Amino acid sequence: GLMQFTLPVRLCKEIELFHFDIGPFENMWPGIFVYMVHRSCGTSCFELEKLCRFIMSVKKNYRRVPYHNWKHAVTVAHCMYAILQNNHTLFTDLERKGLLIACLCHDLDHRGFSNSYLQKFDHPLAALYSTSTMEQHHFSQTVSILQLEGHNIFSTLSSSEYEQVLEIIRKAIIATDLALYFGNRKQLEEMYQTGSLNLNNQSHRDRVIGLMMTACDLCSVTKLWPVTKLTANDIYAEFWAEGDEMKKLGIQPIPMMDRDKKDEVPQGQLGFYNAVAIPCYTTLTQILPPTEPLLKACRDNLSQWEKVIRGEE
Ligand SMILES: COCCN(C)C(=O)c1cnn(C)c1C(=O)Nc1ccn2cc(-c3ccccc3)nc2c1
Ligand SMILES: [Mg+2]
Ligand SMILES: [Zn+2]
Can you list the domains of the chain with their CATH numbers? 28-310 (1.10.1300.10)
Pocket lining: 261 vs ligand 1, CB cutoff 6 Å: yes
d(CA 212, CA 215): 5
Q: What's the DSSP call for residue 220?
A: G
Quick check: 107 and 135 in contact, CB under 8 A? Answer: no
Q: At what angle do helices 225-248 and 292-309 cross, to 10 degrees?
A: 70
Quick check: 115 and 247 in contact, CB under 8 A? Answer: no
d(CA 197, CA 299): 26
Residues 18/228/313/303 CA torsion (nearest 10 deg) = -50
Residue closest to 182 by CA, chosen among 150, 157, 209, 214: 214
Which of 173, 218, 274 best tests ligand 1's pocket when mutated (most atoms within 8 Å of CB)? Answer: 218
Give the closest ligand to the alpha carbon of residue 104: 3
Q: One-letter amino acid identity for 38?
A: H
Helix (H, G, I), strand (E, B) or coil at 296: helix
Residue closest to 254 by CA, chosen among 120, 146, 57: 120
The burial of 226, by beta-carbon neighbours within 10 Å (0-12 exposed, 13-18 middle, 19 or more buried), is given as: exposed
For 218-253, the DSSP string reads TGGGGS-HHHHHHHHHHHHHHHHHHHHHHHHTT-PP
d(CA 49, CA 245): 41
For 255-295, the DSSP string reads GGG-GGGGGGHHHHHHHHIIIIIHHHHHHHHHHSGGGHHHH
Helix (H, G, I), strand (E, B) or coil at 161: helix
Helix (H, G, I), strand (E, B) or coil at 39: helix
Residue 200 — left, alpha, or beta (φ > 0 → left; ψ -120 to 50 → alpha)? alpha
Judge whether 88 counts as a catalytic residue.
Answer: no
Q: At what angle do helices 29-40 and 93-105 cross, to 10 degrees?
A: 160
Q: What is the stated resolution of the deposited model, in angstroms?
A: 2.0
Please give the radius of gyration of the chain, using alpha carbons only, rounded to the nearest integer. 19
Quick check: 267 and 261 in contact, CB under 8 A? Answer: no
Method: X-ray
* Alpha-helix runs per DSSP H in 86-177: 93-105, 115-121, 124-128, 133-146, 159-174
- Ligand 1 nearest atom to the CA of residue 262, by list position: 26
Q: What angle do CA 76, 80, 86 make, to 5 degrees?
A: 145
